[PDB]
Amino acid sequence: SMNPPPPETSNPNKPKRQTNQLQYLLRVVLKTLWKHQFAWPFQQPVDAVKLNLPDYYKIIKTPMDMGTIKKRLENNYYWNAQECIQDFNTMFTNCYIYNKPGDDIVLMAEALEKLFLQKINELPT
Ligand SMILES: Cn1cc(-c2ccc(C(=O)Nc3ccccc3N)nc2)c2cc[nH]c2c1=O
């Protein structure tokens, strides 16, 4: 099909360890973006088949979405906060490199990214 397998969300050989920053990323950053009214197109991998975007996965080499990020956090997949922040950045980058500037989806991503950056600027050190 046009769709790859979804990204892995668990890391079985990784030991489970909580950190203040990972708690913040799940319970402040992800939670705030997830509840936002513009979150829904980002809550699951892009279905290029059903959306009829045949070139999506030609352009996007590293698929990423907030559902994957949520499950990675809930499964303690990330070793540190920077890995999680990278996934958020990749999700936004994908939207901005595939869609045309000013598209509704781009406006929705920009609103979410502003909120993300606002919350990331209060991440505990
Ligand atoms: C990250 N991302 C996401 C999307 C995206 C994802 C899901 C839906 C959706 O389910 N809409 C929908 C609305 C109402 C009824 C049924 C359906 N199916 N729409 C858009 C997209 C489209 C072009 N580009 C993107 C894009 O970059």
Q: What is the DSSP annotation of the chain?
A: ---PPPPP---TTSPP---HHHHHIIIIIIHHHHHSTT-GGGSS---HHHHT-TTHHHH-SS---HHHHHHHHHTT--SSHHHHHHHHHHHHHHHHHHSPTT-HHHHHHHHHHHHHHHHHTT---
Distance 76 CA to ligand 1 centre (A): 28
Cβ contact 108:102 at 8 Å: no
Enter the resolution in angstroms. Answer: 1.4
Domain 20-121: CATH superfamily is Bromodomain-like (1.20.920.10)
Ligand 1 atom nearest residue 98's Cα: 27
Query: What are the extents of the domains in the chain?
Result: 20-121
The structure was resolved experimentally with: X-ray
Ligand 1 atom nearest residue 91's Cα: 1
